[PDB]
Amino acid sequence: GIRNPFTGQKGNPYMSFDEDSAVIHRMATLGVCVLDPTRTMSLIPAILQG
C-alpha cells in the first residue's frame, strides 16, 4: 500500500490497495522423474497401508 515492510520503501506512485499493508507472494513449478522403476526396489512395512 503506502509502504513496503519487505523491501523497506516509504512512498508508492502506483499503489495496490488503500490499506497500510504488504503481501509477499511466491510461486514455483517443480517435478521429478524416475525413468526406470525396475532399476529401483522397495520393501515396505504393511502397517503403513501403502
Q: Which of 31, 2, 29, 41 has its CA nearest to residue 18?
A: 2
Cell 521429478 identifies what position? 32
Q: Is 44 in the site for another protein (CB under 8 A)?
A: no
DSSP 8-state assignment for residue 47: G
Q: Is 5 in the site for another protein (CB under 8 A)?
A: no
Q: Which of residues 8-37 bind another protein (CB under 8 A)?
A: 8-15, 17-21
Question: Cβ 28 to another protein, closest distance in Å?
Answer: 15
- Enumerate the β-bridge partners of residue 9: 4
Contacts with another protein by CB under 8 A lie at 1-4, 6-15, 17-21
